[PDB]
Amino acid sequence: VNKDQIAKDVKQFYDQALQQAVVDDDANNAKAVVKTFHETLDCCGSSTLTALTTSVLKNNLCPSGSNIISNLFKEDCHQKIDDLFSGK
Amino acid sequence: VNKDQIAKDVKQFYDQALQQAVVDDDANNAKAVVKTFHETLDCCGSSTLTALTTSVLKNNLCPSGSNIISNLFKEDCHQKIDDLFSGK
Structure with a gap:
C-alpha cells in the first residue's frame, strides 16, 4: 500500500466530510467525522484559510478549547494527515 | 471515496508498518510511522494480542507513559482507525 496514495x-x-459539515447543518455524520479528525489531529481545516473560516463560523467543529487565533497558526489537517503517514 | 475502503x-x-517495525530493528521509517499512529490514536497494536506483545517487547513504540496493563485494555489501533473514519 503506497503511502502517498493513501495519504491523498x-x-x-x-x-469531502469538511465540505458536507459546513454547508449542511443537518449532515450530522459529516459533522462527527470532521470533529473527530480535528480533535485527533489538532487542526480545523484543509488549509490555514479554511481553518480560519471554520473556527470563526463553526468553532464547534474545531478542537475543544481552540481559538480563532490558535486555529490560524496550527498546521492544517492536510499537513497533519501527511505527518501521520510519514511518521513526523 | 468510500469510508470502508479507505479505513481498510x-x-x-x-x-505493514507495525510488522516492519517489530521484526526489523533497523526499519526506522516504519518505527516512526508506528509510533506516530500509536501516539495519535492512543493504541499500540493491530489487536489486543499484538498490543500486548508490543508493549512488553518494544514499549518504545507505544504511547508515551503507557503500561502493558493499559495497552492491554485500550482499544486496538484497528478500532481507533475505525472510530476516526466513522466519527466516534
Whole structure:
C-alpha cells in the first residue's frame, strides 16, 4: 500500500466530510467525522484559510478549547494527515 | 471515496508498518510511522494480542507513559482507525 496514495485518499475523504459539515447543518455524520479528525489531529481545516473560516463560523467543529487565533497558526489537517503517514 | 475502503487501506498500511517495525530493528521509517499512529490514536497494536506483545517487547513504540496493563485494555489501533473514519 503506497503511502502517498493513501495519504491523498484520506485528505480527499476529510475534504469531502469538511465540505458536507459546513454547508449542511443537518449532515450530522459529516459533522462527527470532521470533529473527530480535528480533535485527533489538532487542526480545523484543509488549509490555514479554511481553518480560519471554520473556527470563526463553526468553532464547534474545531478542537475543544481552540481559538480563532490558535486555529490560524496550527498546521492544517492536510499537513497533519501527511505527518501521520510519514511518521513526523 | 468510500469510508470502508479507505479505513481498510489505512489499517492495512498500519499493519505493514507495525510488522516492519517489530521484526526489523533497523526499519526506522516504519518505527516512526508506528509510533506516530500509536501516539495519535492512543493504541499500540493491530489487536489486543499484538498490543500486548508490543508493549512488553518494544514499549518504545507505544504511547508515551503507557503500561502493558493499559495497552492491554485500550482499544486496538484497528478500532481507533475505525472510530476516526466513522466519527466516534
